[PDB]
Amino acid sequence: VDVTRDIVSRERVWRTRTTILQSTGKNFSKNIFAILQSVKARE
Amino acid sequence: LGRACFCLLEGDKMDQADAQFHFVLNQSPNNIPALLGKACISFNKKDYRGALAYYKKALRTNPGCPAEVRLGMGHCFVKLNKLEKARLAFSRALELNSKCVGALVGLAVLELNNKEADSIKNGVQLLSRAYTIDPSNPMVLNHLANHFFFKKDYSKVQHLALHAFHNTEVEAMQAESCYQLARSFHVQEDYDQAFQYYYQATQFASSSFVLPFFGLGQMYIYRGDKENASQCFEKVLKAYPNNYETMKILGSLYAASEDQEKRDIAKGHLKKVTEQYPDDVEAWIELAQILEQTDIQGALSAYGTATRILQEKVQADVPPEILNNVGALHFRLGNLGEAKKYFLASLDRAKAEAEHDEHYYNAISVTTSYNLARLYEAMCEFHEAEKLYKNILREHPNYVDCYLRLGAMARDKGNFYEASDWFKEALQINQDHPDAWSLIGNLHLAKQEWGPGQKKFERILKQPSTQSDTYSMLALGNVWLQTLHQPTRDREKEKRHQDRALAIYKQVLRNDAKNLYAANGIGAVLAHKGYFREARDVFAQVREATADISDVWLNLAHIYVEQKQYISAVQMYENCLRKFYKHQNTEVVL
Amino acid sequence: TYPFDQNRFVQYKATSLEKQHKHDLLTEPDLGVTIDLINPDTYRIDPNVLLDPADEKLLEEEIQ
């Protein structure tokens, strides 16, 4: 109905699900994938 | 001379023309306009020093010149703010011949600096006399045009700006002609034509000045063309920053979220105007409107003086959208009680919006009541939360979030309640809804015997419209890891499960480097692979990333007791016990 | 969000940014003079030469 688009337009979402999982700092995964490959070097 | 002046007509072979004029000085430097034609070339190469070097040689000799060598003298003195010499040159030009146009229009532009001071002599003596001695001069036509604009004579500006366009043929002049016709039809709201004028004004001579760029950018607010408004307004900041050019990019906020190319510049403009006050009213509104992603206290402060700023120009009550949002801020703060007061007075002000179904104060009250019911949940006043939720759903049953927060409330009581059924009917009203659909399997997390069955109930919206869903695919990883610590790893079954969870974790690794629950999963599965020296490091990363993940506290101390580092472990166990969750969590003391 | 007016129009106006601009004189690209060695049929170099006080203070580049 008009109420649905009427509300979901005017509000805002600053807090979702997905960026909870993502960290507020910058933690890249190269270090993570480097040790991922390093344990594979033990394999 | 004939071939050198042949070159200036076409805009090329210009240094060639200068060379053939300097061929004159090495054959016959016996008169000055041979070398003055060098100096106009030098002037048009923006070398006013090289112009005036030969121009000193003009007035020492002064050949027969009714064309007033002093006119170009003053125009070079117009350059680089040698104005007092420009005035004296145009004056002696007028004394030799008052009929000449260039001196009077030069002083006209020279006193275009002061408009509130010496208005009349600019308007009539400096301009209308030039119009009298030549009514076809596109300079004086342009200047009476912009004067008539400011004198609010919007008729004869369009009489003579067309001629000011046609009579000139150089780009910047007809750029200004199109720009002035554009500002004429802009205040006359004939914006379709004036848009074309603004674009032509930009396209003719662009490096001249930036008002046509501003005209196009604000014209892109017409007709929804605002994508080019940002791009065109960027050159206004490339021109020079001003208070003006903040608000255009601030209101034209393509910055929605995680888009810093419009958001960092928004921050810069907002702290370009926050210290200022060009009657700042909404400046705090669009301050805080990006601050809700950022620090919340900045948004609080913006709303604080924004509450005031609506009271002094007129004692006007704050619109309830502001007050609802500041209560929403205090919801994530400790200021829960006055957040409730904000929602109450928000609903009252929406009631004070008695006739505003255009603005739909009723819908604003709907979402305000949603926020207030969410607040009553924070009070643990689930009774009144039920009341507000059923009030909204009995009047807007199409809404889903109220339909499931009710379900979440009964989930706090338990799973097979109408919790699970509100959740399923939320999919019945909206099967496209990924949040509720995730919450369906979230219910099924309670039934871990429904472990391998969760492939199906987390496949339903693995339709790629919903994909990518990091939350759900990490849920797949988690239901895949709870399979572990079984005596079937030696049977290669949990080894395959470990590597499958590893594959999920690699997938979420590549699509997101900055997820932390992922890295927790990788460290967990490799710790189950017996690499505990290889685990405290990867958990250390998410440890600085955020300490406020209850899982990593446990998983680090598991490593510690695996080195038998109890005196490093149990303290962090009770640190995990510092959350307000459960006085005796069982597995933690286990 | 706030229901902002679409600011498709100027009333402040930009006139602070407008009259600060000093406008070029490009009526004739060789700077408003016909460049000719034939139309000087006359010459002040003959007795007597003429040079106004304004003309000497324009014969200087920058001496103030």
XYZ file of C-alpha atoms in Angstrom:
697
model
C 0.000 0.000 0.000
C 0.899 3.691 -0.002
C 1.869 3.437 3.682
C 4.633 0.929 2.860
C 6.480 3.019 0.268
C 5.403 6.064 2.305
C 7.419 4.936 5.334
C 10.333 2.996 3.811
C 11.277 5.976 1.670
C 11.344 8.594 4.425
C 13.184 6.550 7.055
C 16.864 5.629 6.930
C 18.870 2.551 7.876
C 22.273 3.269 9.338
C 22.549 -0.095 11.056
C 22.075 -3.251 8.979
C 23.002 -6.886 9.508
C 25.920 -7.240 7.153
C 28.203 -4.488 8.419
C 27.940 -5.874 11.921
C 29.947 -8.826 10.613
C 32.323 -6.455 8.855
C 34.649 -4.759 11.323
C 34.702 -1.012 11.933
C 38.495 -0.981 11.675
C 40.455 -2.096 8.642
C 41.405 -5.730 9.146
C 42.423 -7.069 5.767
C 42.722 -10.775 5.073
C 46.044 -10.999 3.254
C 47.713 -11.675 6.620
C 44.863 -14.109 7.171
C 45.234 -15.672 3.753
C 49.034 -15.670 4.105
C 48.821 -17.830 7.198
C 46.088 -19.798 5.428
C 48.653 -20.595 2.768
C 51.339 -21.082 5.409
C 49.411 -23.859 7.117
C 49.026 -25.302 3.619
C 52.825 -25.158 3.434
C 52.826 -27.491 6.425
C 50.391 -29.555 4.354
C 52.707 43.424 -41.740
C 50.099 42.173 -44.204
C 50.879 38.536 -43.549
C 51.446 39.064 -39.826
C 48.041 40.700 -39.393
C 46.779 37.936 -41.680
C 47.769 35.501 -38.905
C 45.810 37.113 -36.048
C 42.558 36.758 -38.011
C 42.834 32.972 -37.918
C 44.320 32.433 -34.457
C 47.385 30.579 -35.740
C 50.858 31.304 -37.133
C 50.944 33.726 -34.229
C 54.616 33.404 -33.342
C 55.150 33.549 -37.112
C 53.381 36.927 -37.130
C 55.549 38.048 -34.215
C 58.646 36.919 -36.135
C 57.662 38.823 -39.286
C 57.058 41.880 -37.129
C 60.515 41.343 -35.652
C 61.737 41.010 -39.215
C 60.492 44.594 -39.470
C 62.727 45.775 -36.602
C 65.755 44.172 -38.208
C 64.863 45.711 -41.558
C 63.205 48.991 -40.461
C 62.289 49.768 -36.813
C 61.277 53.249 -37.941
C 57.733 53.310 -36.541
C 56.043 51.801 -33.500
C 52.869 49.916 -34.684
C 55.325 47.559 -36.375
C 56.379 46.531 -32.851
C 53.027 47.203 -31.195
C 51.584 44.325 -33.197
C 54.188 42.206 -31.465
C 52.874 43.398 -28.139
C 49.249 42.520 -28.840
C 50.472 39.021 -29.721
C 52.403 39.032 -26.431
C 49.274 40.230 -24.615
C 47.188 37.452 -26.160
C 49.875 35.014 -25.028
C 49.106 36.402 -21.516
C 52.567 38.020 -21.495
C 51.569 41.471 -20.299
C 55.216 42.207 -19.505
C 56.184 41.494 -23.103
C 53.216 43.578 -24.180
C 54.120 46.585 -22.032
C 57.786 46.344 -23.029
C 56.854 47.345 -26.579
C 54.003 49.494 -25.262
C 56.474 51.786 -23.504
C 57.811 52.513 -26.995
C 54.362 53.642 -28.157
C 53.802 56.693 -25.956
C 57.385 57.944 -26.234
C 56.734 58.282 -29.961
C 52.917 58.349 -30.353
C 52.432 58.123 -34.135
C 49.240 59.325 -35.752
C 46.741 57.379 -33.724
C 43.104 58.388 -33.317
C 42.689 54.709 -32.346
C 44.273 55.537 -28.965
C 47.397 53.522 -28.211
C 46.502 54.573 -24.643
C 43.392 52.368 -24.867
C 45.458 49.192 -25.081
C 47.749 50.784 -22.505
C 44.861 50.892 -20.051
C 43.728 47.385 -20.965
C 47.189 46.078 -20.120
C 46.849 48.154 -16.967
C 43.489 46.441 -16.471
C 45.570 43.257 -16.317
C 47.377 42.521 -13.029
C 45.478 45.300 -11.189
C 47.303 48.357 -12.519
C 43.926 50.054 -12.257
C 45.027 53.606 -11.432
C 47.143 53.597 -14.589
C 44.194 52.068 -16.450
C 41.961 54.930 -15.280
C 44.494 57.525 -16.395
C 44.948 55.842 -19.776
C 41.202 55.646 -20.395
C 40.890 59.254 -19.227
C 43.447 60.573 -21.725
C 41.800 58.338 -24.313
C 38.566 60.196 -23.590
C 40.342 63.555 -23.783
C 41.800 62.728 -27.192
C 38.418 61.331 -28.256
C 35.396 60.980 -25.996
C 33.603 59.265 -28.893
C 35.753 56.145 -28.455
C 34.038 53.245 -26.700
C 36.879 51.262 -25.103
C 37.813 53.845 -22.470
C 34.267 54.304 -21.163
C 33.522 50.579 -21.046
C 36.913 49.988 -19.431
C 36.038 52.397 -16.638
C 32.541 50.884 -16.571
C 33.970 47.475 -15.716
C 36.538 49.210 -13.492
C 33.691 50.590 -11.380
C 31.711 47.362 -11.669
C 33.606 46.490 -8.479
C 31.533 48.992 -6.477
C 27.817 48.638 -7.165
C 26.328 49.786 -3.848
C 28.875 52.615 -4.074
C 28.529 54.722 -7.243
C 25.582 52.897 -8.773
C 24.225 55.693 -10.963
C 27.480 56.710 -12.653
C 28.063 53.069 -13.553
C 24.513 52.652 -14.844
C 24.185 55.820 -16.931
C 27.526 57.596 -17.388
C 29.705 54.491 -17.596
C 27.188 52.364 -19.427
C 24.318 54.245 -21.087
C 26.759 56.680 -22.670
C 28.554 53.694 -24.197
C 25.152 52.431 -25.336
C 24.551 55.879 -26.819
C 27.834 56.089 -28.723
C 27.325 52.473 -29.805
C 24.086 50.537 -29.219
C 25.639 47.461 -30.867
C 28.479 46.941 -28.382
C 28.017 43.508 -26.775
C 30.047 44.561 -23.705
C 27.688 47.396 -22.789
C 24.703 45.265 -23.815
C 25.880 42.497 -21.450
C 26.456 44.951 -18.636
C 23.127 46.738 -18.958
C 21.679 43.228 -19.175
C 23.092 42.146 -15.826
C 22.251 45.558 -14.362
C 18.625 45.238 -15.539
C 18.703 41.810 -13.940
C 19.778 43.360 -10.642
C 17.521 46.353 -11.286
C 14.863 43.659 -11.927
C 14.173 44.904 -15.453
C 13.598 41.463 -16.907
C 12.175 42.699 -20.216
C 14.856 44.750 -22.006
C 17.564 42.386 -20.786
C 15.965 39.960 -23.239
C 15.655 42.716 -25.813
C 19.371 43.317 -25.873
C 20.964 40.079 -24.642
C 20.010 38.384 -27.904
C 21.829 41.112 -29.822
C 24.628 40.880 -27.242
C 24.766 37.213 -28.234
C 24.595 37.692 -32.007
C 26.780 40.815 -32.278
C 29.648 39.061 -30.525
C 31.424 36.052 -31.969
C 34.027 35.280 -29.305
C 33.069 32.415 -27.002
C 33.311 33.979 -23.523
C 31.171 36.938 -24.531
C 28.476 34.751 -26.034
C 29.002 32.424 -23.081
C 28.120 35.372 -20.861
C 25.233 36.245 -23.178
C 23.779 32.743 -22.867
C 24.496 32.819 -19.136
C 22.634 36.099 -18.717
C 19.670 34.933 -20.768
C 19.775 31.804 -18.617
C 19.687 33.797 -15.376
C 16.868 35.854 -16.894
C 14.696 32.841 -17.684
C 15.790 31.150 -14.457
C 14.226 33.844 -12.288
C 11.422 33.779 -14.863
C 11.330 29.983 -14.345
C 11.617 29.267 -18.083
C 14.152 26.667 -17.090
C 14.041 24.400 -20.155
C 15.464 27.074 -22.443
C 17.713 28.605 -19.781
C 19.183 25.131 -19.186
C 20.283 25.063 -22.821
C 21.735 28.551 -22.382
C 23.660 27.389 -19.316
C 25.065 24.425 -21.221
C 26.074 26.595 -24.172
C 27.613 29.096 -21.746
C 29.735 26.331 -20.255
C 30.576 24.882 -23.650
C 31.701 28.135 -25.282
C 34.449 29.250 -22.891
C 34.809 27.094 -19.801
C 38.091 28.203 -18.194
C 36.866 31.815 -17.993
C 34.649 31.689 -14.905
C 32.378 29.301 -13.066
C 28.914 30.921 -12.887
C 27.725 28.978 -15.985
C 28.870 25.803 -14.220
C 26.829 26.797 -11.185
C 23.883 27.524 -13.457
C 24.026 24.084 -15.048
C 24.487 22.377 -11.696
C 21.475 24.057 -10.130
C 19.627 23.446 -13.393
C 20.280 19.753 -12.953
C 18.164 20.007 -9.818
C 15.440 20.726 -12.328
C 14.274 17.642 -14.241
C 16.116 15.292 -11.877
C 19.399 15.678 -13.749
C 21.424 15.893 -10.567
C 24.147 13.385 -11.498
C 25.826 15.982 -13.667
C 25.160 18.594 -10.975
C 27.797 16.998 -8.743
C 30.284 16.685 -11.603
C 29.744 20.275 -12.721
C 29.869 21.640 -9.173
C 33.188 19.893 -8.600
C 34.748 22.503 -10.878
C 33.304 25.193 -8.607
C 35.481 23.785 -5.848
C 38.211 23.451 -8.453
C 37.582 27.133 -9.138
C 37.713 28.233 -5.469
C 35.772 27.213 -2.342
C 32.971 29.364 -0.958
C 30.116 29.142 1.506
C 27.691 29.026 -1.477
C 29.180 25.915 -3.015
C 28.901 23.912 0.164
C 25.099 23.775 0.346
C 24.655 22.674 -3.269
C 26.715 19.528 -2.688
C 25.302 19.130 0.804
C 21.653 19.217 -0.257
C 22.529 17.380 -3.468
C 23.729 14.527 -1.310
C 24.374 11.473 -3.417
C 26.254 10.432 -0.300
C 23.908 7.773 1.019
C 26.201 5.304 2.832
C 29.770 4.006 2.412
C 30.222 6.496 -0.433
C 32.998 8.805 0.724
C 33.494 10.492 -2.663
C 30.274 12.351 -1.829
C 30.547 11.872 1.919
C 34.021 13.113 2.848
C 33.397 16.213 0.752
C 30.099 16.474 2.621
C 32.055 16.414 5.886
C 34.365 19.120 4.565
C 31.501 21.363 3.477
C 29.655 20.747 6.720
C 32.649 21.877 8.719
C 32.959 24.629 6.148
C 29.537 25.931 7.200
C 29.209 24.848 10.831
C 31.596 27.549 12.012
C 29.842 29.919 9.645
C 26.317 31.265 9.864
C 24.851 32.562 6.587
C 21.519 32.163 8.385
C 22.278 28.498 8.969
C 19.027 26.646 9.588
C 19.197 23.160 8.112
C 23.016 23.171 8.107
C 22.903 21.150 11.313
C 20.225 18.887 9.816
C 22.441 17.798 6.945
C 25.334 17.792 9.391
C 23.723 15.109 11.497
C 22.143 13.453 8.452
C 25.538 11.945 7.660
C 26.597 11.802 11.299
C 24.238 8.915 12.034
C 26.688 6.535 10.407
C 29.485 8.308 12.284
C 29.798 9.452 15.892
C 26.344 9.873 17.371
C 27.334 12.704 19.727
C 28.019 14.967 16.759
C 24.480 14.286 15.586
C 23.260 15.056 19.107
C 25.056 18.398 19.114
C 23.735 19.236 15.652
C 20.175 18.501 16.781
C 20.840 20.474 19.963
C 21.439 23.807 18.292
C 19.025 22.791 15.536
C 16.324 22.658 18.195
C 17.242 26.214 19.126
C 17.573 27.573 15.597
C 13.881 26.944 14.864
C 12.885 29.200 17.756
C 14.500 32.605 17.216
C 13.426 33.540 13.677
C 9.941 32.477 14.778
C 8.931 30.512 17.838
C 8.257 27.420 15.731
C 7.868 23.965 17.229
C 10.490 21.476 16.077
C 9.084 19.091 13.450
C 8.666 15.617 14.918
C 11.018 13.948 12.432
C 13.903 15.685 14.211
C 12.647 14.764 17.651
C 12.019 11.139 16.713
C 15.519 10.899 15.298
C 17.158 12.400 18.384
C 15.247 9.912 20.511
C 16.528 7.271 18.096
C 20.042 8.504 18.794
C 19.554 8.334 22.560
C 18.225 4.796 22.104
C 21.739 3.632 21.283
C 22.970 5.893 24.060
C 22.234 5.653 27.755
C 19.633 8.409 27.501
C 16.712 6.011 27.270
C 14.260 8.002 29.386
C 14.517 11.288 27.534
C 14.550 9.245 24.341
C 11.099 8.124 25.471
C 10.175 11.751 26.163
C 11.383 12.593 22.653
C 9.124 9.947 21.166
C 6.154 11.156 23.214
C 6.611 14.775 22.170
C 7.301 13.551 18.629
C 3.900 11.890 18.542
C 2.370 15.053 19.986
C 4.022 17.234 17.341
C 2.802 14.834 14.673
C -0.619 15.305 16.235
C 0.181 19.012 15.974
C 0.706 18.261 12.261
C -3.076 18.056 12.136
C -3.489 18.499 8.369
C -0.240 17.171 6.887
C -1.136 13.952 5.093
C 1.043 15.304 2.301
C 3.998 14.965 4.692
C 2.125 11.959 6.162
C 2.554 12.685 9.842
C 0.416 9.572 10.330
C 3.121 7.429 8.698
C 5.731 9.298 10.707
C 3.714 8.461 13.819
C 3.671 4.846 12.645
C 7.442 4.603 12.519
C 7.708 6.734 15.669
C 5.483 4.280 17.501
C 7.646 1.501 16.091
C 10.680 3.177 17.635
C 8.820 3.717 20.906
C 7.759 0.077 21.058
C 11.369 -0.886 20.415
C 12.164 1.436 23.317
C 9.568 -0.235 25.538
C 11.379 -3.445 24.716
C 14.520 -1.740 26.054
C 12.517 -0.839 29.188
C 11.443 -4.488 29.003
C 7.925 -3.032 28.998
C 6.832 -5.770 26.645
C 3.209 -5.180 27.626
C 3.125 -1.677 26.166
C 5.393 -2.892 23.367
C 2.659 -5.397 22.504
C 0.131 -2.571 22.688
C 1.954 -0.257 20.277
C 2.795 -3.112 17.921
C -0.778 -4.359 17.705
C -2.001 -0.787 17.287
C 0.197 -0.430 14.237
C -0.538 -3.868 12.814
C -4.279 -3.432 13.276
C -3.942 -0.243 11.223
C -1.080 -1.129 8.930
C -0.887 -4.936 8.708
C 1.305 -4.659 5.598
C 4.240 -3.787 7.868
C 6.629 -6.597 8.720
C 9.136 -5.356 11.292
C 6.452 -4.865 13.927
C 5.095 -8.262 12.855
C 8.388 -9.936 13.741
C 9.550 -7.922 16.746
C 6.388 -9.269 18.309
C 7.627 -12.631 17.089
C 11.051 -11.898 18.555
C 9.411 -11.025 21.871
C 7.711 -14.415 22.011
C 10.987 -15.970 20.858
C 12.412 -14.663 24.118
C 9.681 -16.793 25.649
C 10.351 -19.590 23.151
C 10.469 -21.044 19.643
C 7.223 -22.945 18.885
C 5.097 -20.028 20.054
C 3.300 -17.677 17.689
C 6.838 -16.325 17.573
C 7.556 -18.941 14.897
C 4.223 -18.232 13.248
C 4.476 -14.471 13.050
C 7.879 -15.258 11.597
C 6.410 -17.624 9.011
C 3.525 -15.293 8.159
C 6.052 -12.504 7.750
C 7.338 -14.698 4.942
C 3.726 -15.266 3.898
C 3.163 -11.530 3.588
C 6.683 -11.100 2.151
C 8.639 -14.175 1.039
C 11.139 -11.828 -0.584
C 12.085 -10.543 2.869
C 15.629 -11.720 3.664
C 15.673 -10.520 7.268
C 12.606 -12.516 8.280
C 13.705 -15.429 6.109
C 17.029 -15.495 7.951
C 15.129 -15.329 11.225
C 13.227 -18.456 10.147
C 16.411 -20.482 10.231
C 17.514 -18.551 13.293
C 14.593 -20.237 15.011
C 15.938 -23.537 13.734
C 19.290 -22.850 15.332
C 17.592 -23.838 18.592
C 16.888 -27.285 17.136
C 20.408 -28.413 16.380
C 19.082 -31.895 15.587
C 17.685 -29.891 12.675
C 21.282 -29.327 11.646
C 21.513 -31.011 8.235
C 17.944 -29.930 7.526
C 19.041 -26.305 7.604
C 20.541 -26.640 4.127
C 17.002 -26.421 2.736
C 15.722 -23.662 5.032
C 18.851 -21.670 4.264
C 18.632 -22.411 0.543
C 15.215 -20.804 -0.094
C 16.622 -17.302 -0.542
C 19.890 -18.438 -2.019
C 18.206 -17.029 -5.055
C 20.767 -14.584 -6.457
C 18.502 -11.581 -5.983
C 19.178 -12.071 -2.270
C 22.759 -13.185 -2.874
C 25.189 -12.130 -1.736
C 23.983 -12.705 1.840
C 27.060 -12.776 4.061
C 24.907 -13.292 7.147
C 23.241 -16.422 5.803
C 26.384 -17.936 4.339
C 28.181 -17.453 7.629
C 25.153 -19.169 9.147
C 25.863 -22.033 6.737
C 29.441 -22.059 7.980
C 28.263 -22.104 11.589
C 25.760 -24.920 11.137
C 28.545 -26.647 9.283
C 31.012 -26.190 12.147
C 28.668 -27.448 14.860
C 29.024 -30.764 13.015
C 32.591 -30.969 14.335
C 34.173 -32.491 17.457
C 32.844 -35.947 16.630
C 34.688 -39.300 16.644
C 34.328 -39.521 12.829
C 37.159 -37.136 11.874
C 39.526 -40.102 11.491
C 36.892 -41.414 9.044
C 37.739 -38.315 6.922
C 34.144 -37.126 7.348
C 34.879 -34.241 9.677
C 38.053 -33.591 7.698
C 35.830 -33.030 4.666
C 33.554 -30.953 6.881
C 36.527 -28.886 8.056
C 37.642 -28.292 4.493
C 34.081 -27.489 3.399
C 33.729 -24.917 6.167
C 37.176 -23.709 5.102
C 35.824 -23.331 1.564
C 32.869 -21.298 2.848
C 35.307 -19.217 4.851
C 37.559 -18.675 1.845
C 34.495 -17.568 -0.118
C 33.477 -15.056 2.541
C 37.164 -14.140 2.846
C 37.398 -13.127 -0.804
C 34.074 -11.325 -0.884
C 34.836 -9.560 2.424
C 38.276 -9.151 3.953
C 36.897 -7.139 6.875
C 34.307 -9.561 8.247
C 35.369 -10.738 11.674
C 32.991 -13.635 12.320
C 34.560 -15.179 9.235
C 38.082 -14.998 10.693
C 36.693 -16.372 13.933
C 35.401 -19.272 11.855
C 38.742 -19.852 10.131
C 40.564 -19.815 13.445
C 37.989 -22.144 14.981
C 38.222 -24.702 12.194
C 42.024 -24.666 12.201
C 41.984 -24.971 15.985
C 39.780 -28.015 15.482
C 42.533 -28.988 13.045
C 44.896 -28.815 16.012
C 46.734 -25.612 15.087
C 46.403 -23.651 18.297
C 49.699 -21.834 17.995
C 48.306 -20.958 14.567
C 45.045 -19.770 16.127
C 45.850 -17.172 18.777
C 47.305 -14.925 16.083
C 44.215 -14.960 13.862
C 42.024 -14.423 16.905
C 44.340 -11.630 18.003
C 43.379 -9.763 14.825
C 39.659 -9.795 15.563
C 40.619 -9.071 19.165
C 41.923 -5.629 18.268
C 39.185 -5.312 15.643
C 36.521 -5.452 18.342
C 36.752 -6.940 21.811
C 32.950 -7.019 22.075
C 32.496 -10.448 20.520
C 31.638 -12.968 23.203
C 32.977 -15.909 21.192
C 36.600 -14.838 20.859
C 36.985 -14.535 24.636
C 36.246 -18.263 24.917
C 38.292 -19.338 21.922
C 41.412 -17.529 23.112
C 41.224 -19.110 26.553
C 40.805 -22.535 24.966
C 44.219 -21.958 23.432
C 45.559 -20.733 26.780
C 44.481 -23.858 28.635
C 45.877 -25.793 25.698
C 49.233 -24.321 26.721
C 47.901 -24.791 30.289
C 47.979 -20.977 30.639
C 45.209 -20.915 33.225
C 46.436 -17.679 34.806
C 45.895 -16.075 31.408
C 42.597 -17.843 30.748
C 40.141 -17.780 33.661
C 40.439 -14.015 34.091
C 39.336 -13.577 30.509
C 36.580 -16.103 31.164
C 35.183 -13.896 33.906
C 35.797 -10.951 31.595
C 33.367 -12.686 29.263
C 31.186 -12.923 32.369
C 31.169 -9.120 32.518
C 28.246 -8.946 30.109
C 24.715 -8.574 31.507
C 23.528 -11.866 30.059
C 23.449 -14.743 32.571
C 24.835 -15.092 36.052
C 25.849 -18.739 35.594
C 26.546 -19.500 31.996
C 27.186 -23.211 31.973
C 29.617 -23.927 29.162
C 31.866 -21.070 30.283
C 32.517 -22.589 33.689
C 32.801 -25.931 31.940
C 15.004 12.270 6.383
C 14.180 15.895 6.084
C 11.859 17.055 3.289
C 14.230 19.550 1.723
C 13.137 22.162 -0.764
C 14.619 21.530 -4.170
C 16.799 24.626 -4.522
C 16.304 25.089 -8.251
C 16.529 28.865 -7.935
C 18.714 31.709 -6.680
C 17.495 34.429 -4.317
C 20.468 34.998 -1.967
C 21.766 35.776 -4.688
C 25.185 34.677 -5.880
C 25.798 38.439 -6.280
C 28.666 38.323 -3.790
C 30.306 35.815 -6.134
C 29.114 37.833 -9.129
C 30.198 41.458 -8.736
C 33.515 40.299 -7.287
C 34.318 39.196 -10.835
C 36.055 41.906 -12.841
C 35.144 41.450 -16.472
C 37.620 41.216 -19.337
C 37.746 43.556 -22.319
C 38.183 41.418 -25.439
C 36.254 43.500 -27.984
C 39.130 43.439 -30.457
C 41.721 40.661 -30.038
C 44.621 43.019 -30.778
C 43.362 45.112 -27.814
C 40.972 47.638 -29.284
C 43.375 49.360 -31.683
C 43.664 49.128 -35.438
C 47.310 48.181 -35.906
C 48.550 50.173 -38.890
C 51.692 51.912 -40.091
C 49.793 53.696 -42.878
C 47.086 55.602 -40.978
C 49.781 57.538 -38.962
C 49.811 60.233 -41.629
C 50.577 62.540 -38.693
C 53.408 62.311 -36.162
C 54.035 64.280 -32.979
C 57.788 63.609 -33.336
C 57.983 66.801 -35.398
C 58.397 70.065 -33.460
C 56.804 70.143 -31.150
C 56.453 66.826 -29.331
C 53.569 66.474 -26.875
C 53.728 64.559 -23.599
C 51.145 65.219 -20.854
C 51.963 64.646 -17.153
C 49.492 61.771 -17.317
C 51.476 60.582 -20.340
C 54.786 60.571 -18.449
C 53.267 58.721 -15.492
C 52.039 56.135 -18.009
C 55.499 55.905 -19.617
C 56.650 54.164 -16.446
C 56.131 50.463 -15.821
C 56.060 50.503 -12.013
C 57.699 53.470 -10.284
C 54.514 54.747 -8.575
